Design a protein around this ligand. Sequence first.
Ligand code: NA
Length: 129
Amino acid sequence: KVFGRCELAAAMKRHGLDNYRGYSLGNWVCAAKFESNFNTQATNRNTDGSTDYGILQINSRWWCNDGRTPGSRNLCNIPCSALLSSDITASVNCAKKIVSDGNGMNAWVAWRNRCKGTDVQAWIRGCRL
Ligand code: NA
């Protein structure tokens, strides 16, 4: 599923991401935009052999099991394929654990490099929220 901007904002708000750990909703929409272009089926491989999955590009090195990342962890207790679903529940629940791990949204390289320090509220302008 490729989400619309306001569609994703509403779904993220319904799942409790608005101001979660102090990050306003525009931060999450901005992160999703530059991580996956709003596409739940996005995958990208990392140099160490791990893979990032779904709309928030969650990494198999720590957070999910994809059967091909030896020596890694599965801290969200999910198969990585679950993160590619049109239902974003698994991605949002896992993202809540990531952002709570001490580094905040700096865990997402695209957020730090393309969202942090910008007017992130622009990403929800015009939406009925
Ligand atoms: Na893993």
